[PDB]
Amino acid sequence: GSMLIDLITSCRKSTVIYAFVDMGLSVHFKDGACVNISELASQYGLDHSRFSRLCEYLIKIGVLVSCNEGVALSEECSALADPESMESLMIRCEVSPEYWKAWSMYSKSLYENNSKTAFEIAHGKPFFEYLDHHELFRSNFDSFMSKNSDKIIEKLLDIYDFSQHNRILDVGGGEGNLLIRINEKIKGKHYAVLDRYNETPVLEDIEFINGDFFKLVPSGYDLYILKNVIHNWSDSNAILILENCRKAMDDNATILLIGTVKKLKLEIIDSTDILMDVLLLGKERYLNELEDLAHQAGFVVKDIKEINEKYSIIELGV
Amino acid sequence: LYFQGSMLIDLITSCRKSTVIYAFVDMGLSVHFKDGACVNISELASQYGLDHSRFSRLCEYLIKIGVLVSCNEGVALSEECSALADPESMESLMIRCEVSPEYWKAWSMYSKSLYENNSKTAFEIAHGKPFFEYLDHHELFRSNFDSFMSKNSDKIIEKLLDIYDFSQHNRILDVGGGEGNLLIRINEKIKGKHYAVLDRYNETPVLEDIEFINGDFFKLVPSGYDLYILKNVIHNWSDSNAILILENCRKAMDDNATILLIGTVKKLKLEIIDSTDILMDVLLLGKERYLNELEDLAHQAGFVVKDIKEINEKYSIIELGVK
Numbered sequence: 001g002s003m004l005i006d007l008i009t010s011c012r013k014s015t016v017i018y019a020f021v022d023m024g025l026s027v028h029f030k031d032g033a034c035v036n037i038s039e040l041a042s043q044y045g046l047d048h049s050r051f052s053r054l055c056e057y058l059i060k061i062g063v064l065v066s067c068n069e070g071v072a073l074s075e076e077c078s079a080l081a082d083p084e085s086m087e088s089l090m091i092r093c094e095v096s097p098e099y100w101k102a103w104s105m106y107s108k109s110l111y112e113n114n115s116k117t118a119f120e121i122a123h124g125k126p127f128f129e130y131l132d133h134h135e136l137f138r139s140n141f142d143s144f145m146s147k148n149s150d151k152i153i154e155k156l157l158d159i160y161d162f163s164q165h166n167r168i169l170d171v172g173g174g175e176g177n178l179l180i181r182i183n184e185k186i187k188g189k190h191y192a193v194l195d196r197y198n199e200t201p202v203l204e205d206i207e208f209i210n211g212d213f214f215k216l217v218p219s220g221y222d223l224y225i226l227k228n229v230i231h232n233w234s235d236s237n238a239i240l241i242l243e244n245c246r247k248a249m250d251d252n253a254t255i256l257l258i259g260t261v262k263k264l265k266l267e268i269i270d271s272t273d274i275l276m277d278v279l280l281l282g283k284e285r286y287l288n289e290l291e292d293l294a295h296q297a298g299f300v301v302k303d304i305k306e307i308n309e310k311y312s313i314i315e316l317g318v
Numbered sequence: 319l320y321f322q323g324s325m326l327i328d329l330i331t332s333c334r335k336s337t338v339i340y341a342f343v344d345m346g347l348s349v350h351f352k353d354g355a356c357v358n359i360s361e362l363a364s365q366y367g368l369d370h371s372r373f374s375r376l377c378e379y380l381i382k383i384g385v386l387v388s389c390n391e392g393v394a395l396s397e398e399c400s401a402l403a404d405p406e407s408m409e410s411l412m413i414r415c416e417v418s419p420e421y422w423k424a425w426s427m428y429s430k431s432l433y434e435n436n437s438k439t440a441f442e443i444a445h446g447k448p449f450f451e452y453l454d455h456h457e458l459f460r461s462n463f464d465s466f467m468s469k470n471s472d473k474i475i476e477k478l479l480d481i482y483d484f485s486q487h488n489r490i491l492d493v494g495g496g497e498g499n500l501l502i503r504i505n506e507k508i509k510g511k512h513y514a515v516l517d518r519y520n521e522t523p524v525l526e527d528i529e530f531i532n533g534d535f536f537k538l539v540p541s542g543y544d545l546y547i548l549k550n551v552i553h554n555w556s557d558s559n560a561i562l563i564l565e566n567c568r569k570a571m572d573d574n575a576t577i578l579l580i581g582t583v584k585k586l587k588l589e590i591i592d593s594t595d596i597l598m599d600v601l602l603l604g605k606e607r608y609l610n611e612l613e614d615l616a617h618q619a620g621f622v623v624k625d626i627k628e629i630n631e632k633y634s635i636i637e638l639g640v641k
């Protein structure tokens with residue numbers, strides 16, 4: 001059962017990558033620089049032989065590659081060299097006590113018809129409520145989300161004309177990095193961000209609204225953006241968000257759904273689908289499923305545009 | 319389109335494969351997947367009161383990682399993952415340990431354990447006690463761990479009996495034998511011997527054919543046995559702690575007596591042995607060893623290496639004598 005034992009012990013890959021990132025030595029691996037294990041251990045005060053053993057495993061799983069009298073990050077794993085990279089922040093969330101405690105309650109959550117989220121069962125609060133009481137975890141999560149916007153922003157500005165819109169609300173925009181990046185290219189607009197803040201953010205070019213899209217969505221916007229929001233929610237909660245958007249919107253107003261649309265048979269989509277179930281009782285959805293939500297909320301699909309293998313844009317109207 | 323960082327993101331999210339396998343095992347449904355049976359997702363969901371769509375979405379991911387395969391009526395276990403059908407399999411019990419809060423929190427502190435100035439295991443930094451002391455105060459975690467180890471013996475017993483004549487011996491001590499399942503399985507084939515097990519017990523087990531001894535192999539090993547078995551013990555320990563166990567064995571043994579070292583050897587450059595090397599570091603500041611490194615421990619402890627025989631790609635038996 002060599003394949004089954006490889007699958008069972010898959011978590012050991014995530015935990016050694018976490019350990020590498022957490023040691024704060026990634027700065028020295030930048031631009032594929034060849035780092036000497038001995039020089040690194042002496043500098044940091046690390047156990048040489050034990051750190052060497054870690055490096056050998058990181059080579060075997062393809063994070064590190066052997067270089068002349070040392071080790072370097074593989075080209076595919078170069079992002080780990082930057083501690084503020086999406087991938088560096090992602091691993092901190094992935095093997096967090098928040099995540100693995102939530103995962104432990106997944107099996108229990110699947111048996112219960114009107115289950116609380118596996119996360120709520122584990123922690124006594126739903127995911128976004130929990131973020132209010134955990135500054136460090138929220139900071140890491142919000143920054144991780146901001147770096148996700150950085151990865152698709154170039155492709156986004158190409159395939160959709162944002163200049164046609166004058167009043168733009170980022171619904172669940174968090175730090176508001178989407179509108180920060182859009183603002184860099186598109187100036188002289190009204191940019192607003194709706195989210196839940198302990199302390200409401202302040203920027204010169206972006207307005208921030210401390211609210212709750214289950215209570216109401218602000219009216220007076222001709223574009224409503226929902227990036228990586230819908231997949232956080234059950235069908236009932238998703239419809240309630242779209243319904244609140246509908247009550248806010250006049251007949252000419254646009255909704256942009258930005259995020260994963262299930263179609264390409266990718267493992268990262270399937271695995272993220274199960275994580276959304278664990279954390280939020282959310283899901284990744286097929287177009288027809290998103291279409292069904294849209295219709296029920298009183299919208300129609302006007303257009304679909306592919307960003308990449310993971311992400312598409314869905315333009316809603318009415 | 320892009321696939322920017324897809325390989326790194328796959329490695330980062332690798333733990334999701336462990337946690338869905340845990341969830342599948344923990345649901346206790348694998349019995350319906352026995353003998354490569356084709357399972358209808360809607361029927362199983364109905365029978366157990368599962369949310370049909372949530373359970374179908376789990377099954378889809380399990381197909382993608384290779385645990386399940388499509389059949390005409392729904393899903394079957396892949397031949398490769400058929401062991402998950404048995405809820406008492408080594409693999410079923412392994413995943414319970416692998417994604418235990420004990421392991422997760424130990425892994426969190428691995429980065430802090432590697433600092434030269436420190437001498438504590440990542441496990442002790444996490445839990446405030448070392449691994450084996452922690453077992454004493456946590457019955458559920460100990461039960462899963464001891465059960466996991468017993469099933470490891472079930473996997474190798476057939477091959478082990480084929481490559482070593484246990485019938486030649488009269489008195490056999492299983493040093494760190496836990497539940498004593500290695501001796502239970504030997505006793506089924508080879509009868510009339512004196513079988514004893516040494517380990518740390520809150521309640522000393524009782525069996526008709528097997529004697530259980532509550533002890534500490536760092537203090538002393540019971541004398542008067544002609545075979546001492548150290549199965550999956552050496553890799554738990556530093557060189558000095560390993561030599562101390564072997565020294566206590568030599569002091570206990572007469573000139574005629576045999577030690578059998580049974581365990582994992584670094585031979586074929588296997589990812590699983592490399593990953594277990596790191597796990598042994600995280601839990602116990604232990605390590606996996608090359609054959610020459612094991613020979614060196616034996617020699618330093620004052621033993622002759624008399625025979626080496628392969629069980630499989632991971633496991634070997636090393637026979638030690640005093641002469």
Ligand SMILES: Nc1ncnc2c1ncn2[C@@H]1O[C@H](CSCC[C@H](N)C(=O)O)[C@@H](O)[C@H]1O
Nearest residue numbers: 128145146172173174195196212213227228
């Ligand atoms: N009730 C609520 N009202 C407003 N925002 C909410 C909310 N519940 C969750 N959110 C926000 O929804 C966001 C989901 S994560 C996506 C963040 C951002 N749109 C991006 O794509 O990067 C988080 O910022 C979270 O704080």
Ligand SMILES: Nc1ncnc2c1ncn2[C@@H]1O[C@H](CSCC[C@H](N)C(=O)O)[C@@H](O)[C@H]1O
Nearest residue numbers: 450467468494495496517518534535549550
């Ligand atoms: N000081 C000590 N004295 C005796 N046994 C000990 C010990 N420290 C650890 N052990 C035991 O060493 C074993 C390691 S796991 C190996 C279990 C068994 N021999 C098998 O192969 O399946 C555990 O059962 C643990 O309880």
Ligand code: NA
Nearest residue numbers: 277281282283
């Ligand atoms: Na769900």
Ligand code: NA
Nearest residue numbers: 342346347348
């Ligand atoms: Na099961």
